[PDB]
Design a protein around this motif. Structure first.
Motif, PDB file in Angstrom:
ATOM      1  N   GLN A   1       6.447 -18.505   0.165  1.00 14.76           N
ATOM      2  CA  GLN A   1       6.633 -17.246   0.874  1.00 14.76           C
ATOM      3  C   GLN A   1       6.791 -17.437   2.374  1.00 14.76           C
ATOM      4  O   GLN A   1       7.608 -16.748   2.996  1.00 14.76           O
ATOM      5  CB  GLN A   1       5.455 -16.305   0.611  1.00 14.76           C
ATOM      6  CG  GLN A   1       5.736 -14.855   0.971  1.00 14.76           C
ATOM      7  CD  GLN A   1       4.472 -14.028   1.099  1.00 14.76           C
ATOM      8  OE1 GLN A   1       3.362 -14.554   1.025  1.00 14.76           O
ATOM      9  NE2 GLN A   1       4.634 -12.724   1.295  1.00 14.76           N
TER      10      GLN A   1
ATOM     11  N   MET B   1      10.757 -12.892   2.511  1.00  6.31           N
ATOM     12  CA  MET B   1      10.078 -11.917   1.669  1.00  6.31           C
ATOM     13  C   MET B   1      10.997 -11.482   0.537  1.00  6.31           C
ATOM     14  O   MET B   1      12.017 -10.825   0.766  1.00  6.31           O
ATOM     15  CB  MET B   1       9.651 -10.709   2.503  1.00  6.31           C
ATOM     16  CG  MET B   1       9.120  -9.543   1.689  1.00  6.31           C
ATOM     17  SD  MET B   1       7.322  -9.565   1.572  1.00  6.31           S
ATOM     18  CE  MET B   1       6.883  -9.226   3.275  1.00  6.31           C
TER      19      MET B   1
ATOM     20  N   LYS C   1      -2.608 -12.213  -7.758  1.00  2.00           N
ATOM     21  CA  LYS C   1      -3.714 -11.383  -7.300  1.00  2.00           C
ATOM     22  C   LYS C   1      -4.358 -10.596  -8.429  1.00  2.00           C
ATOM     23  O   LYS C   1      -5.571 -10.362  -8.397  1.00  2.00           O
ATOM     24  CB  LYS C   1      -3.240 -10.413  -6.212  1.00  2.00           C
ATOM     25  CG  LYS C   1      -4.369  -9.694  -5.494  1.00  2.00           C
ATOM     26  CD  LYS C   1      -3.915  -8.347  -4.962  1.00  2.00           C
ATOM     27  CE  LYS C   1      -5.097  -7.511  -4.504  1.00  2.00           C
ATOM     28  NZ  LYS C   1      -6.000  -7.165  -5.637  1.00  2.00           N
TER      29      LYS C   1
ATOM     30  N   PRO D   1      -8.535 -13.817  -7.714  1.00  4.45           N
ATOM     31  CA  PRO D   1      -8.009 -13.446  -6.393  1.00  4.45           C
ATOM     32  C   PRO D   1      -8.271 -14.478  -5.310  1.00  4.45           C
ATOM     33  O   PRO D   1      -9.145 -14.284  -4.459  1.00  4.45           O
ATOM     34  CB  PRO D   1      -8.734 -12.129  -6.089  1.00  4.45           C
ATOM     35  CG  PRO D   1     -10.009 -12.223  -6.850  1.00  4.45           C
ATOM     36  CD  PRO D   1      -9.712 -13.015  -8.093  1.00  4.45           C
TER      37      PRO D   1
ATOM     38  N   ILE E   1      -4.552 -12.163  -1.604  1.00  2.00           N
ATOM     39  CA  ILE E   1      -4.537 -10.707  -1.640  1.00  2.00           C
ATOM     40  C   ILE E   1      -3.203 -10.224  -1.091  1.00  2.00           C
ATOM     41  O   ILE E   1      -2.767 -10.664  -0.022  1.00  2.00           O
ATOM     42  CB  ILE E   1      -5.709 -10.099  -0.840  1.00  2.00           C
ATOM     43  CG1 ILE E   1      -7.045 -10.666  -1.327  1.00  2.00           C
ATOM     44  CG2 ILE E   1      -5.703  -8.585  -0.966  1.00  2.00           C
ATOM     45  CD1 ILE E   1      -7.540 -10.056  -2.622  1.00  2.00           C
ATOM     46  N   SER E   2      -2.554  -9.327  -1.830  1.00  2.00           N
ATOM     47  CA  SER E   2      -1.286  -8.754  -1.408  1.00  2.00           C
ATOM     48  C   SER E   2      -1.038  -7.472  -2.188  1.00  2.00           C
ATOM     49  O   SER E   2      -1.222  -7.424  -3.407  1.00  2.00           O
ATOM     50  CB  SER E   2      -0.124  -9.733  -1.614  1.00  2.00           C
ATOM     51  OG  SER E   2       0.099  -9.979  -2.992  1.00  2.00           O
ATOM     52  N   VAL E   3      -0.612  -6.436  -1.473  1.00  2.00           N
ATOM     53  CA  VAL E   3      -0.332  -5.145  -2.089  1.00  2.00           C
ATOM     54  C   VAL E   3       1.116  -4.740  -1.835  1.00  2.00           C
ATOM     55  O   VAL E   3       1.858  -4.434  -2.768  1.00  2.00           O
ATOM     56  CB  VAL E   3      -1.296  -4.061  -1.575  1.00  2.00           C
ATOM     57  CG1 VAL E   3      -2.738  -4.451  -1.863  1.00  2.00           C
ATOM     58  CG2 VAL E   3      -1.089  -3.831  -0.087  1.00  2.00           C
TER      59      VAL E   3
ATOM     60  N   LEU F   1     -13.212 -11.898   1.534  1.00  2.00           N
ATOM     61  CA  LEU F   1     -12.409 -11.045   0.664  1.00  2.00           C
ATOM     62  C   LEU F   1     -11.852  -9.844   1.414  1.00  2.00           C
ATOM     63  O   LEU F   1     -10.694  -9.468   1.201  1.00  2.00           O
ATOM     64  CB  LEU F   1     -13.231 -10.580  -0.539  1.00  2.00           C
ATOM     65  CG  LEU F   1     -13.398 -11.576  -1.688  1.00  2.00           C
ATOM     66  CD1 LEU F   1     -14.796 -11.497  -2.277  1.00  2.00           C
ATOM     67  CD2 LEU F   1     -12.348 -11.329  -2.759  1.00  2.00           C
TER      68      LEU F   1
ATOM     69  N   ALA G   1      -9.079 -11.132   3.999  1.00  2.00           N
ATOM     70  CA  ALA G   1      -7.842 -11.428   3.290  1.00  2.00           C
ATOM     71  C   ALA G   1      -7.155 -10.177   2.766  1.00  2.00           C
ATOM     72  O   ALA G   1      -5.958 -10.222   2.464  1.00  2.00           O
ATOM     73  CB  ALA G   1      -8.116 -12.394   2.133  1.00  2.00           C
ATOM     74  N   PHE G   2      -7.881  -9.066   2.661  1.00  2.00           N
ATOM     75  CA  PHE G   2      -7.316  -7.783   2.265  1.00  2.00           C
ATOM     76  C   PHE G   2      -6.826  -6.954   3.439  1.00  2.00           C
ATOM     77  O   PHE G   2      -5.852  -6.214   3.292  1.00  2.00           O
ATOM     78  CB  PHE G   2      -8.353  -6.971   1.477  1.00  2.00           C
ATOM     79  CG  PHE G   2      -7.887  -5.596   1.091  1.00  2.00           C
ATOM     80  CD1 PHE G   2      -6.909  -5.426   0.127  1.00  2.00           C
ATOM     81  CD2 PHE G   2      -8.431  -4.475   1.691  1.00  2.00           C
ATOM     82  CE1 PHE G   2      -6.481  -4.162  -0.230  1.00  2.00           C
ATOM     83  CE2 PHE G   2      -8.008  -3.208   1.338  1.00  2.00           C
ATOM     84  CZ  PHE G   2      -7.032  -3.052   0.376  1.00  2.00           C
TER      85      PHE G   2
ATOM     86  N   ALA H   1      -3.702  -8.383   4.350  1.00  2.00           N
ATOM     87  CA  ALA H   1      -2.788  -8.091   3.252  1.00  2.00           C
ATOM     88  C   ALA H   1      -2.156  -6.715   3.404  1.00  2.00           C
ATOM     89  O   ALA H   1      -0.982  -6.534   3.065  1.00  2.00           O
ATOM     90  CB  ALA H   1      -3.518  -8.191   1.914  1.00  2.00           C
ATOM     91  N   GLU H   2      -2.912  -5.741   3.903  1.00  2.00           N
ATOM     92  CA  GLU H   2      -2.387  -4.408   4.159  1.00  2.00           C
ATOM     93  C   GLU H   2      -1.442  -4.379   5.351  1.00  2.00           C
ATOM     94  O   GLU H   2      -0.610  -3.471   5.447  1.00  2.00           O
ATOM     95  CB  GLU H   2      -3.537  -3.422   4.372  1.00  2.00           C
ATOM     96  CG  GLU H   2      -4.350  -3.148   3.119  1.00  2.00           C
ATOM     97  CD  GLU H   2      -3.619  -2.260   2.131  1.00  2.00           C
ATOM     98  OE1 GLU H   2      -2.798  -1.429   2.572  1.00  2.00           O
ATOM     99  OE2 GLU H   2      -3.871  -2.388   0.915  1.00  2.00           O
TER     100      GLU H   2
ATOM    101  N   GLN I   1       0.638  -6.950   5.653  1.00  2.00           N
ATOM    102  CA  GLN I   1       1.814  -7.402   4.919  1.00  2.00           C
ATOM    103  C   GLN I   1       2.501  -6.249   4.199  1.00  2.00           C
ATOM    104  O   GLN I   1       3.709  -6.311   3.942  1.00  2.00           O
ATOM    105  CB  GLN I   1       1.411  -8.495   3.929  1.00  2.00           C
ATOM    106  CG  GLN I   1       2.565  -9.242   3.283  1.00  2.00           C
ATOM    107  CD  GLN I   1       2.942  -8.660   1.934  1.00  2.00           C
ATOM    108  OE1 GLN I   1       2.139  -7.984   1.292  1.00  2.00           O
ATOM    109  NE2 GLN I   1       4.165  -8.925   1.494  1.00  2.00           N
ATOM    110  N   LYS I   2       1.760  -5.196   3.872  1.00  2.00           N
ATOM    111  CA  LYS I   2       2.329  -4.031   3.205  1.00  2.00           C
ATOM    112  C   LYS I   2       3.235  -3.251   4.150  1.00  2.00           C
ATOM    113  O   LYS I   2       2.908  -3.056   5.320  1.00  2.00           O
ATOM    114  CB  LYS I   2       1.220  -3.123   2.671  1.00  2.00           C
TER     115      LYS I   2
END
Lengths: 191, 302
Positions: free
Chosen positions: A165, A170, A182, A186, A189-191, B70, B73-74, B77-78, B80-81
């Motif tokens: 990645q 992307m 994920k 985990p 983490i990726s949403v 955790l 890393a979240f 991650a948001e 990245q959203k």
């Protein structure tokens, strides 16, 4: 005749095309007309999977001309994917990048039909390490999406996907693979 | 015992037995045991957006680093959203010795630029303590100062990993007037800020607000006029302080503040809003201000 015709093709495979007295295509076109009625039995699909892509004539048009309609009649068996894991072997022959793309496209499309998906799942890393290829990535990602299990989410694979990645762009295929990892243990983490 | 007790608590609360509570005046709280002076003083003059947080399931004040990892890393991650998350127990922000120890959640950005510094506490909250099981570490209060975008994302992470939920705490004008009355009833000295009550008239076309910003000593001598029973503040005493405000505002401006609603009560003890962005904690009465805030978050929980 379908088995006999592909042994005839194999006879063309033991000799040069120039030294052959008959066309290599016409017999495979009769086979294609057969596929229009009945594509390939499990043993027949196994055989036409294993030989027609390793080193022999297997022309990047002729090999693909089959691979488009090379799908199984009953299903795909373990011995089909075994010796064609030596087609993903990716060397002096390599089943070159256009037929490789078609190969992984076939592996995604006919992934609904495997007798034991567990055996291929135990072949997870072999396809995962082929994901480094840019041409194979959009289809190897789909294959791994259908291939994944918890035993195949080792942290080195997670960091390899993150390295892919970062190095690459992307991509929805990589995004789908990451969201699935994920969904499993985990380490990312990726949403 | 473990669930039916909460059932009875809810039943009693909804039954609405007489609840003018003779709440004790906030007492000067000597900084108990090990409260980090730098950390506690960092939490005082900072505007906390109040939330009511349900008990954290399977929570432990031993596994701080792995929860921090955790959540960090979240958070990225948001995006990245560039972001660090440091869970920090406070060791002394509890009313009873059996209360769950308060812990912080700080989004630290190179240097210690604390972006969010969210804060969970349970002080004098033994009404929800004796109703949860042992697996739940009940922290009714949640205190987030950073941007609402980070708050409404760490809240989602907490919901996902602890089954704890964040209803945004809203102090109604009733509790706002209450805390306004007891925070002028304290024995504090060197009043930090003027005792301001931000009203808001209910006009449909317009949105007029009023700031009844008393001199903090004049609001103390005015409270002593309406203070008769010592130690405890009565709803009659609270309403008499508010009515002395009302009849000293209508005496001048001829508009009824009682026809309006409190939106903010700035006090030398602690400023307090209604919409959630409530707790400014100027003075170190905060073990009682937060006691009221937790007992109000328990009400929203139960």
């Amino acid at each position: 005749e379908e088995d006999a015709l592909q042994m005839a093709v194999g006879y063309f495979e033991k000799g040069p095309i120039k030294a052959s007295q008959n066309k290599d295509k016409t017999l495979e076109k009769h086979l294609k007309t057969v596929e229009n009625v009945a594509w390939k039995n499990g043993l027949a699909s196994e055989e036409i999977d294993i030989l027609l892509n390793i080193a022999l004539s297997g022309k990047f048009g002729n090999a693909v001309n089959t691979r488009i309609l090379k799908c199984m009649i009953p299903a795909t068996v373990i011995s089909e994917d075994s010796v064609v894991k030596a087609v993903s072997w990716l060397c002096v022959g390599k089943c070159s990048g256009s037929t490789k793309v078609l190969f992984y496209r076939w592996l995604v499309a006919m992934f609904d039909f495997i007798d034991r998906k567990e055996q291929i799942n135990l072949l997870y890393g072999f396809f995962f390490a082929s994901l480094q290829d840019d041409a194979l990535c959009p289809y190897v990602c789909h294959l791994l999406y259908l291939l994944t299990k918890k035993e195949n989410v080792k942290p080195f694979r997670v960091r390899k996907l993150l390295d892919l990645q970062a190095k690459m762009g992307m991509q929805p295929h990589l995004q789908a693979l990451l969201s699935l990892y994920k969904f499993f243990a985990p380490a990312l983490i990726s949403v | 015992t473990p669930l039916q007790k909460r059932l009875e608590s809810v039943r009693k609360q909804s039954s609405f037995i007489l609840t003018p509570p003779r709440r004790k005046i906030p007492q000067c709280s000597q900084l108990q045991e090990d409260v980090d002076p730098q950390k506690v003083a960092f939490l005082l003059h900072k505007q906390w957006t109040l939330y009511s947080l349900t008990p954290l399931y399977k929570f432990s004040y031993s596994n701080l680093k792995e929860y921090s990892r955790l959540l960090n890393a979240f958070i990225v991650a948001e995006k990245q959203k560039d972001i660090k998350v440091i869970f920090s127990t406070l060791l002394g922000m509890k009313g009873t010795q059996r209360d769950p120890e308060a812990f912080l959640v700080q989004i630290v950005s190179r240097e210690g630029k604390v972006l969010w510094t969210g804060w969970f506490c349970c002080v004098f909250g033994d009404s929800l303590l004796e109703t949860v099981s042992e697996d739940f570490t009940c922290l009714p209060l949640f205190l987030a100062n950073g941007a609402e975008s980070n708050t409404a994302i760490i809240g989602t992470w907490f919901q996902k990993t602890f089954d704890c939920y964040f209803s945004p705490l809203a102090i109604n004008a009733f509790n706002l007037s209450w805390m306004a009355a007891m925070w002028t009833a304290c024995k504090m000295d060197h009043y930090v800020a003027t005792t301001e009550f931000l009203w808001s008239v209910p006009c449909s076309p317009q949105s007029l607000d009023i700031s009844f910003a008393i001199h903090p000593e004049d609001a103390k001598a005015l409270w002593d006029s309406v203070h008769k029973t010592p130690g405890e503040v009565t709803q009659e005493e609270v309403d008499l302080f508010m009515d002395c405000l009302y009849s000293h505002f209508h005496r001048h401006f001829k508009i009824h503040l009682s026809a309006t609603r409190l939106v903010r009560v700035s006090t030398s003890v602690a400023s307090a809003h209604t919409d959630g962005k409530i707790k400014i904690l100027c003075h170190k009465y905060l073990i009682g201000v937060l006691a009221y805030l937790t007992e109000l978050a328990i009400f929203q929980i139960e």
